[PDB]
Write a protein that binds this ligand. Sequence first.
Ligand code: HEC
Length: 87
Amino acid sequence: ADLANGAKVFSGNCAACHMGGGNVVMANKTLKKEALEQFGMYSEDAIIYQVQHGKNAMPAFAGRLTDEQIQDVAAYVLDQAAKGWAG
Ligand code: HEC
């Protein structure tokens, strides 16, 4: 319904550092849900704050993406990992 935009942003910005719900910089913090939620933060508000300002080595997106994707792109990962991360 609206997360279609999520993949539009993750597949055009977050993909450069994830692509396949698999972190491309770290070796654990991923997008699927086990690692990003292993420690605790696989929730919209979680990655939403890790997206509006990346975190550690991730590039903020408070205004890099569009806006409805700094949001949708988060709920987006909750939709892709919850049923086949764009498998
Ligand atoms: C390359 C550098 C980037 C880019 C362009 C994006 N991410 Fe993000 N991401 C990156 C690193 C190095 C890490 C680990 C840093 C950390 O989280 O401590 C992450 C992590 C995430 C996570 C996990 C958050 C956590 O559990 O701490 C998520 C959910 C995540 N990244 C999402 C995400 C999205 C949707 C992107 C586009 C807005 C995105 N990242 C880009 C590095 C990078």
